[PDB]
Amino acid sequence: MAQRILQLAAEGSPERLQEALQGLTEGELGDMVTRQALRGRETAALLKGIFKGSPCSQQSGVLRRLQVYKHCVSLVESGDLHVGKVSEIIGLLMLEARQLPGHALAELATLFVEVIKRGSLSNGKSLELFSTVLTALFKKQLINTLCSSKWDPQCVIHLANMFRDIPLSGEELQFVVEKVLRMFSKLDLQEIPPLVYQLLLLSAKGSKKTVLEGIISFFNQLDKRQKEEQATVPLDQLRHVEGTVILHIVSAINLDQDIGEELIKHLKTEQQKDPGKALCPFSVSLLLSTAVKHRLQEQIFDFLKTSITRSCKDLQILQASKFLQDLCPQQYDVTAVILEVVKNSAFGWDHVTQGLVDLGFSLMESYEPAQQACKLGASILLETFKVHEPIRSDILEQVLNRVLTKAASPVSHFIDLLSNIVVSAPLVLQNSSSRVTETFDNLSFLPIDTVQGLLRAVQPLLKVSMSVRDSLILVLQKAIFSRQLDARKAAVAGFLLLLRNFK
Amino acid sequence: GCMPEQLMQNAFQNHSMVIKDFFPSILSLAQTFLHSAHPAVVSFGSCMYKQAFAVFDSYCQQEVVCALVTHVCSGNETELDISLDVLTDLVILHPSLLLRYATFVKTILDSMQKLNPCQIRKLFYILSTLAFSQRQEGSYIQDDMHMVIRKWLSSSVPNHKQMGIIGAVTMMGSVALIECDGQLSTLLDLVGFCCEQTPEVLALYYDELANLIEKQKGNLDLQLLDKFGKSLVEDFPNDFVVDLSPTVDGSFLFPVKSLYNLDEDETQGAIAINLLPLVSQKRVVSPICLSPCFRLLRLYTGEQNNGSLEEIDALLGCPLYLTDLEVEGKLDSLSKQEREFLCSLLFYALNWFREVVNAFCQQQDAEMKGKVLTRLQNITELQNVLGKCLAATPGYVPPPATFDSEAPAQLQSYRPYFRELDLEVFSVLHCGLLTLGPAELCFLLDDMCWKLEHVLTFSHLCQRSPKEVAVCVVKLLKPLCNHMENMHNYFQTVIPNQGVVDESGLNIQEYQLMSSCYHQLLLAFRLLFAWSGFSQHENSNLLRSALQVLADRLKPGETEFLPLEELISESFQYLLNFQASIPSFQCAFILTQVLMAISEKPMTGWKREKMASLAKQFLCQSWMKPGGDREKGSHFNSALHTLLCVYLEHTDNILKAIEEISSVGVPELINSAKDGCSSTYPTLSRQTFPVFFRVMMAQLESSVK
């Protein structure tokens, strides 16, 4: 039909095109589906061809315009075209689309996915034109019966990635959610990554509550099930799902993570049943791996503190009872939660689980029951030294100079902690002792009792290698010739009153 | 003043190993001292971030690009510009490394809720420079770029429609140097339909065609350049300005002769008066097609030519078809058709001519030289008629000119709608003496000065470099201002007595603003020869390479003359002219400041004492001021404070002369007469004696207390 539009409306204004196609009659849509593999830029050639009839979205093209529409929105809406022509037809369409007739443009276009998407979908390209006609302007009643009312595989990406430009979150957020469960959940590894990312970005309008509560709610239902029935594994794919939903919450955490704090410690820690809400593994894993940043020390430290406090000082005050301790509730142990998280985070949540080593070095000392609190903090620091093997060498160096240069209170907590750490250190420095060989000289000003315990604790490591001892002997001997206070003695005897004294 | 950026730049050169463990420090501070409001700190921190990119490990390399993009998404204003600057620097500084953070670079692309046209051009520039690198990531950048394209193109939001074209051209030119030929063709016809019913979007396509053309030198390529230009091949001669045959009547009120008609070109042609013939009555008034589009076609004539000379010859004086506009009162008793018609006609005519010269300036053929003279003459004359119409457009003469097409009767009512004067064609160092005709120095110099102080210390103006501004000023300043000042000071000094003969026709005709032109020229000398940024490794040697031609009368000496007395002596020899006839006290404060900037570096024997000579001469300059409103009493005592404080600036605070100077207030209330407690001359006045004696009491009793 190459001569057709360009001979009717090719040369002539008032009666050329109207005459040479008053009844060209291929349906409404002869050439563009009479020459599917048409002549290069024929797509817009013929597009302005029909456009010689009347404008875009115009009522006068009851068969001409709207039938160019019916042809393109469906056949090249789902079938095969040129992907580039799959840009071009929609280009020229979107362009003409501004000039529609105020009724004549209302196609099956308020829920008219029920016209096309509900039974005919699978190619995303076509979705944008709905955004175009919509922006042209309610009609979303089909949206009520289907936010994805048959979105089997294609009510997740395609509907969202245009729900950006022309979406409504009142039931569109919720409908995404309800779909997430076993429909949306059908994708394995696509269940929370892609839809989650789109979900948050579309959240950028709002829905702090309803778009917050669900990512973790779904996460925690999945967890409670796949635990009480017995990237990680076929039963560790909780690793991938966690990695996404966290890293997404963390990265976008800028402006509305004040709301995540506000809710996930204003709901659970208000009605108090948070031991089953404000402590689930995948619902605080965020709380303390999206907090190693700068605006997070001041709220996260205080939250976890008051939690450990109220939790322990309740769930003991009914551990001496029967007339109120046996015909009575259950308790979920906040200490057991945090000790769980130390167990679960062995999978790889790196910047989700360096908040721990920081939690240890900055609770298990400075925390001050109160003695129970410090006793707890021993657990976080020690266990974190226990499980995840690459990230503790800096833990030990935080400790040594946290507790080998201070006032007299630093004997007990940190001294016992260094004792237990090095003592649990199965040669943890047993080839890594280079912070020490310049720690050791600092000691000639410590108190009376501290110099002993420093000697004793390091006394495990002294058994290893003469690079420890051949430098100890010197950095002490020098003390004896000069002032040489009890420290030279505590040391002379300690080396002597030891097997190191032999040979 | 301590802690120079030279230091920290050195620090990176000597503190690799000692620095490497700084990692929390450099980073965590830099964003606290690289978004703070004092220009040294911001320039420092920018040196920080860029240097940080110079020196780090992998996680460091990433931490940088992340801190940037985090600034880019949400930010403040100066942080905005600094973010983009830091970016464009990083990305055009070393390309082949800065790509690893690419997809992280892209994550701003679908959150960047912030653009001006400027930053929009910037971000497009970053994305273009990235996009032409990869294959499939450049695909998805094409996806977001077609995506932002099509979504723009359909946008009815006012900013969105132009923003589309600005980035459309932006990404195209980024194209300008797989299936990129085809995708870009899809965009090509896409933009084509997208504008082919929009005129202003036309002007977008053209003008934005220009800047990408000119700011390349060997990257714009002819086989590549042929595409977007061919529909811009004949399009100017095809429709722009209707032909000139002596019978072409029709719809018009004003008889379209060759009125105002140059005819400085040849004596046979059909490049007629195209204005009335193809614009005004033409279709609906064409805002930029007649002028900006001529700019684009002359731009293709320049760059698209690469040496084009006759393509504008064929109407090189084809004079516009506006009838002779001498009846401005012959427009009185009517309005709003001939009024606004004349207003848009005058705007268009000033456009046609100012472009005819702006593209006609730097062309160095002889007949081009004479035509440029005739053009400046017609420009001044039509400017006189246009000022008469500016009074005749008291109330409504809006900017129908090309308002840059990129956004979304008085002295300054015509600041916007004027076109943009050139960047190499403000220089003709041979406009000889008139009394270069009469107004030509004033015009070319006002166009020098109205922004020459902006750069020193409009978008095509600032797109050049102020360092390049100094470079060109040094390369071309002395050869014009030398002959100008040398003739003009003594001319105003000896013609003034001829003004005493009733020679006001010589006074308000020979140099009625010849003094004003002198005062401009002196202000230009002061602004240029003292660059504020001379205090560095560059502008000091600059000020010296300017002094090495400052030497007006006699030589500078040998291959080097390090003692500045050749400079101060060229300065005294210069002041020898206008120590005879300075045109007024308004020029008085100017001669003072221009001495004080560069001639007033050392304050010692014959110079600080010369400061005594200057302050005592400024007091000695006998007063010349008629009496009206109190306008000159706003700076004529602020300047007086500098003058008396300059006679006491070369010296100390004058607790000796200040006694009779306050006694000068005792004659200063003598009558309507200047400082006259035995003086009777300027340095005092009717109202200026009160504030002036008050400041003299300040300069004495703020120290002597």
From Swiss-Prot, chain A:
Site of covalent link Glycyl lysine isopeptide (Lys-Gly) (interchain with G-Cter in ubiquitin): K478
Mod. after translation: Monoubiquitinated by FANCL during S phase and upon genotoxic stress. Deubiquitinated by USP1 as cells enter G2/M, or once DNA repair is completed. Monoubiquitination requires the FANCA-FANCB-FANCC-FANCE-FANCF-FANCG-FANCM complex. Ubiquitination is required for binding to chromatin, DNA repair, and normal cell cycle progression. Monoubiquitination is stimulated by DNA-binding. Phosphorylated in response to DNA damage by ATM and/or ATR. Phosphorylation of FANCI promotes ubiquitination of FANCD2, which prevents DNA release from the FANCI-FANCD2 complex.
Signal peptide range: none
Similarity comment: family membership: Belongs to the Fanconi anemia group I protein family.
Biological function: Plays an essential role in the repair of DNA double-strand breaks by homologous recombination and in the repair of interstrand DNA cross-links (ICLs) by promoting FANCD2 monoubiquitination by FANCL and participating in recruitment to DNA repair sites. The FANCI-FANCD2 complex binds and scans double-stranded DNA (dsDNA) for DNA damage; this complex stalls at DNA junctions between double-stranded DNA and single-stranded DNA. Participates in S phase and G2 phase checkpoint activation upon DNA damage.
Record's subunit section: Homodimer. Part of a FANCI-FANCD2 heterodimeric complex that binds and scans dsDNA for DNA damage. Interacts with FANCL. Interacts with MTMR15/FAN1. Interacts with POLN. Interacts with UBL5; the interaction promotes FANCI homodimerization.
Protein name per UniProt: Fanconi anemia group I protein
Organism: Gallus gallus (Chicken)
Lineage: Eukaryota, Metazoa, Chordata, Craniata, Vertebrata
